[PDB]
Design a protein around this ligand. Structure first.
Ligand SMILES: [Mn+3]
Lengths: 1024, 121, 129
């Protein structure tokens, strides 16, 4: 293929002239930023791009500019195209290893100045932190080299090419290559120089090239440790190295964005609290091993660090170069079948975090990453998986300093090889225990393809060697969903040779033939349990543990049943936790035309919005946080299920159990919320517990002092005693009032002092109910009892298909008889309505009796619903009344779960209390769907201006409710597409279907499904 | 079900007082067309329609007219609704033999002249 | 504000475009003048501060735009514009004046006018449609 350049279709051409990967250290004196505006031109394909050996700056000067770093699909007015979203499917034809012939080619150009002294004093390099997909590099019209690996770095020696005065850098960037085949992550396709570019000036005659730091405990009691520091010095003109370790700074250290990101400086004195000093001797190995007496451990719960300074020293005793970094005393092992840190079998409270920003894409400002991690810490997360590639190299100090267990993952995904297979065989489902046999069929294309070995090894080598020295990284991952083949085995051997100190993960390797850990994604409990049992021997020993690298798919309303996963995690030593998918929605900000308005509004794009030929729609929106990286109810729920302290209140006792891996409860203040006075809680070690006698209902565990990125008073854990349903002390007026009853041909009227009740007998509709200045009426379309909800993302694949199939959205009330009688025991009147509630097309439905017992200040509504007929649905979304609220309506207040929404399998984070609608910002979903329900509601007060409240309560059971404004939710593509009525309604529900995680994972669990059955429930509408 | 009239939910009430079916023959001397404009009003359900035992022509005169023959879902400006297409599925719930309670009811009315000789002959 | 302070005046009248440079120092050389009616560019002589030029043209709408990225502005960024004043033209809507039978019902409170495709009801008490 001579119409496609050779290097874009050669899997072995991983780079040309790239320097060997070394440990990353940012040094202000060495690093010089080349970020900013560059001359840029985009071409249809390589053959239209100019020859860079002949490109003048005088020619390139005339081009438009683009700012580095940025993706070229994310420019003002979509100048160079729009983003493309695919999940599994490749957006190109599969013709390994050829990319498409029409291959967008972007040529970048800029200049930089070089001194006379500069070329003499320094070795000059260019370092590119990330370029997608690949590029060739030119300096002063001379070819320097080539590079593949979009999320990896690259350094090139530039010394031969540089001149005094102006120097010209030209980068030719290509969108596609043979490399595309191994870069098929479920994310946006975006191109360009999207990370930093730097000019490095290293001391010429001698400099530090690489450093290796390891900490190994000498002992099984993890006290004394050997600190090993090995240095690779390049050049002759040096004497020796000095090394100074400083006294530790406890992990409780206070940070903010400013201090975490401070990059200074040359004259800045790193530290002076010396602890250990070592010097090397002239002509001796530039490495050493030191015994360290009982050092402070580095842990994710307490990220204690020892700062160090490493000095290269010349003959005259002057400092040639310094490295200022840190050591975290930590050892990871596979021990008695568990992932062990410092001897302790840890628990992952994790997420997958992609690089994403709603405007900049994968070109994420560090400021924004910090924001992410602070939020994670604020929500009890202790681990992150770098799905599915290494991040910007500066991010790893952030993990080191804040304390996260990190899975650093190779930039390698091959998923798309499966798509044609899936479609050809009409595959419906993949299961963690069996799906590997499906991937085995296509492994030969890439992961079991010898032509790709060099590429696969390069991804491994690049991954490990850049980030080896970060204590936060405990596991290297071979990539994601790339099948299983010989190349993975090769990666495993290499990583163990390069870095024996960490463990290797790869989920595509079911039996971990070349991994140290087992890993499932989205498994069922049954599947987890099968695996556990088949890998635990008769003695109870297991050789390797199980993590869930992805679980609890966080797409839209959900995930449900995080609780049940957690119970499982705590019950078995074999399970060591999981990482939920995903941290945040991948929404891109754009201008949307409103379906509600006819006008232009800001929205967040998912597949289809940028008009891709092929895309995967709303699967972009699968985070615990929204596109703006703010918490959803998903994140709020997750924080509660993973809380590292359990607080149980029962039988006049508070039981507190420490569920941390390492730290004590000493940092926590326990407050009795009923009294406001604090509770003296003994210092609890991991797994220790205490029972304290108390009359309390509600106990909170809170942070005593600012520590890390958390503030004093920040809530870590809490517990409540279960709250019995109490009937409000409302006094029903049972005194005898004269009442006019008018039973007309169609309409029935009940009028009394302060009361007006009109019912349409033909429809079963309340035309108007006005009691003491407060008015409601039925929001009626076909039925007075409704069942539908705007489908959640989870509802879509199955439950929605069923509900639509059985016409649940078209349920009709057909009145059979209406009975009107005078009031009995204090009653004004009794109106009884007999009907069948059944959808068009169908037999199934409910023989329904609605008894309205009318009092002067109250209306008792008894509902009896008998499920009858053949060919029934399995379940319903919902069941209850819809009422229009009067013009007077202003706000509401409830006793129940809050402040936010709650659903059967997504409710426990929402504690009991009295809540006011005025105190709550109701959550807006990036993709409109079922929202705003409040479950386990004891009573609901609806406030009408100038007329007090209407109190609503269900007899003997808590109920569900939603008060809103909105409709057209099913078909609104974005928040701005949601329509709004000129008045509010109350959705008053007996029951509601759970939420689950079926968009990618298990169906709503049995105990949370709203199964088809008879419904019987009684409501009171009490008017003040 | 007293909100649905008895004759609309009785499979056996095929007719009341219909003459026995006979072979059809059109005869110009016997057949007199009553096609043309009729007073017409549409009601939500049987219970909203007037009692025809008490409906004057003086009352029905005041209604809009519809032309016979024609379907009421095919009028100028879709005045009395639009056509519904279903293939297999019933457009109503299945509760044999009940129709839906909301059951569009159209009342037609017109007059014709009769001679002294006519009733005799 | 951007419009009233635009540093180039573009006036279109009597088959002429008059362009006046209202900068203090710079020339118009950095600007591309586009005839928006045709899309083709207009050759405008280099104008010094306060200098102007009249160019015969049939154009209705002329835009002054940046030729190249300069400072913090992008190529194609609008600096100034002008339009010829637009006369009010009655749309070419054809009113149906053919004779259609129409039912007029002048009730006690409400007045109805019904015809094929038309329904007009007015509340005479309120003056409300
Ligand atoms: Mn939209």
């Amino acid at each position: 293929s001579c119409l496609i350049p050779e290097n874009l279709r050669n899997p072995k051409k991983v780079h040309e002239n790239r320097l060997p990967t070394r440990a990353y250290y940012y040094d202000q004196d060495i690093f010089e930023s080349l970020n900013g505006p560059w001359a840029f031109a985009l071409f249809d394909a390589p053959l239209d791009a100019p020859d860079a050996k002949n490109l003048d700056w005088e020619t390139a000067k005339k081009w438009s500019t683009i700012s580095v770093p940025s993706h070229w699909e994310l420019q003002e007015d979509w100048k160079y195209g729009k983003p493309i979203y695919t999940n599994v499917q490749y957006p190109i034809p599969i013709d390994i290893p050829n990319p498409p012939t029409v291959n967008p080619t972007g040529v970048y150009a800029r200049t930089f100045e070089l001194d006379s002294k500069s070329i003499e004093s320094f070795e000059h390099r260019l370092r590119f932190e990330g370029v997608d997909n690949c590029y060739e590099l030119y300096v002063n019209g001379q070819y320097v080299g080539f590079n593949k690996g979009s999320r990896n770095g690259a350094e090139f020696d530039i010394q031969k090419y540089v001149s005094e005065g102006e120097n010209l850098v030209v980068v030719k960037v290509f969108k596609w290559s043979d490399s595309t085949y191994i870069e098929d992550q479920d994310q946006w396709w975006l191109s360009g120089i999207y990370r930093d570019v730097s000019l490095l000036k290293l001391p010429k005659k001698a400099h530090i090239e690489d450093v290796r730091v390891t900490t190994t405990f000498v002992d099984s009691q993890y006290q004394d440790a050997e600190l090993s520091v090995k240095v690779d010095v390049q050049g002759s003109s040096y004497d020796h190295i000095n090394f100074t370790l400083y006294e530790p700074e406890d992990g409780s250290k206070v940070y903010d964005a400013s201090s975490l990101l401070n990059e200074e400086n040359g004259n800045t004195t790193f530290s002076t609290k010396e602890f250990i000093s070592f010097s090397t001797k002239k002509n001796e190995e530039t490495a050493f091993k030191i015994n360290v007496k009982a050092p402070e451990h580095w842990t994710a719960e307490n990220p204690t660090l020892y700062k160090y300074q490493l000095d290269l020293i010349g003959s005259d005793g002057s400092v040639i170069q310094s490295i200022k970094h840190h050591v975290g005393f930590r050892q990871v092992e596979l021990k008695d079948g568990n992932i062990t840190v410092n001897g302790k079998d840890i628990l992952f409270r994790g997420v997958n975090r992609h690089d994403h920003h709603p405007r900049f894409g994968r070109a994420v400002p560090l400021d924004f990453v910090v924001r992410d991690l602070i939020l994670m810490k604020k929500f009890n997360i202790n681990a992150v998986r770098n799905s599915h590639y290494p991040n910007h190299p500066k991010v790893y100090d952030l993990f080191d300093k804040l304390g996260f267990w990190v899975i650093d993952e190779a930039d390698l995904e091959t998923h798309g090889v499966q798509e044609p297979f899936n479609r050809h065989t009409n595959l419906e489902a993949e299961y963690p225990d069996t799906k590997n046999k499906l991937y085995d069929v296509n492994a030969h294309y890439l992961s079991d393809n010898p032509e790709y070995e060099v590429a696969y090894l390069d991804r491994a080598s690049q991954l490990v060697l850049r980030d080896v020295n970060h204590p936060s990284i405990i596991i290297w991952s071979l990539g994601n969903e790339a099948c299983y083949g010989r190349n993975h085995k090769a990666m495993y051997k290499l990583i163990k040779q390069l870095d024996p100190t960490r463990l290797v993960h790869y989920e595509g390797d079911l039996n971990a033939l070349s991994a140290d850990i087992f890993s499932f994604m989205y498994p069922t409990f049954e599947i987890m349990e099968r695996w556990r049992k088949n890998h635990t021997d008769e003695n109870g020993k297991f050789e390797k543990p199980l993590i869930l690298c992805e679980y609890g798919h966080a797409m839209g309303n959900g995930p449900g049943s995080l609780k049940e996963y957690q119970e499982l995690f705590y019950k078995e030593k074999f399970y060591q936790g999981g990482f939920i998918w995903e941290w945040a929605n991948h929404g891109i900000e754009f201008e949307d035309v409103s379906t509600a308005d006819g006008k232009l509004h800001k929205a967040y794009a998912y597949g289809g919005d940028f008009k891709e030929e092929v895309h995967d729609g709303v699967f972009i929106m699968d985070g615990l946080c929204n596109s703006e990286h703010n918490p959803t109810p998903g994140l709020v729920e997750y924080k509660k299920v993973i809380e590292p302290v359990h607080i149980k209140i029962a039988h006049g006792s508070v039981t507190i159990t420490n569920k941390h891996d390492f730290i004590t409860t000493d940092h926590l203040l326990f407050i009795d919320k009923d009294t406001g006075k604090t509770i003296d809680v003994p210092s609890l070690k991991p797994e220790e517990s205490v029972t304290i006698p108390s009359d309390t209902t509600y106990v909170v565990a809170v942070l005593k002092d600012d520590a890390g990125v958390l503030k004093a008073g920040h809530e870590i854990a809490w517990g409540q005693a279960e709250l019995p349903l109490k009937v409000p002390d409302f006094v029903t007026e049972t005194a005898e009032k004269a009442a006019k009853i008018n039973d007309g041909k169609r309409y029935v009227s009940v009028e009394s002092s302060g009361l007006h009740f009109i019912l349409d007998k033909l429809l079963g509709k309340i035309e108007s109910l006005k009691v003491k200045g407060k008015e409601i009426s039925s929001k009626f379309e076909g039925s007075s009892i409704t069942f539908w909800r705007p489908p959640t993302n989870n509802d879509e694949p199955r439950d929605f298909k069923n509900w639509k199939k059985y016409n649940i959205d078209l349920m009709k009330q057909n009145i059979h008889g209406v009975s009107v009688e005078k009031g009995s025991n204090g009653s004004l009147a009794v109106v009884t309505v007999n009907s069948r509630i059944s959808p068009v097309v169908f037999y199934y439905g409910f023989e329904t009796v609605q008894k309205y017992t009318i009092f002067a200040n109250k209306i008792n509504l008894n509902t009896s619903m008998k499920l009858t007929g053949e060919y029934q649905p399995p379940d319903f979304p919902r069941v209850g009344y819809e009422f229009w609220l009067g013009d007077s309506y202003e706000s509401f207040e409830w006793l129940g779960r809050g402040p936010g929404e709650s659903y059967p399998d997504k409710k426990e984070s929402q504690r009991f209390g009295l809540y006011d609608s005025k105190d709550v910002e109701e959550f807006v979903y990036d993709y409109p769907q079922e929202n705003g329900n409040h479950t386990d509601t004891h009573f609901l007060n609806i406030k009408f201006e100038g007329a007090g409240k209407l109190s609503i309560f269900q007899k003997e059971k808590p109920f569900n409710f939603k008060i809103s404004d909105e409709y057209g939710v099913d078909e609104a593509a974005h928040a701005c597409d949601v329509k709004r009525y000129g008045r509010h309604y109350l959705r008053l529900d007996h029951a509601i279907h759970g939420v689950g995680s079926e968009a990618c994972g298990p169906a709503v669990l049995d105990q949370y499904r709203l199964k088809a059955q008879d419904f019987n429930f009684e409501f009171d509408l009490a008017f003040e």
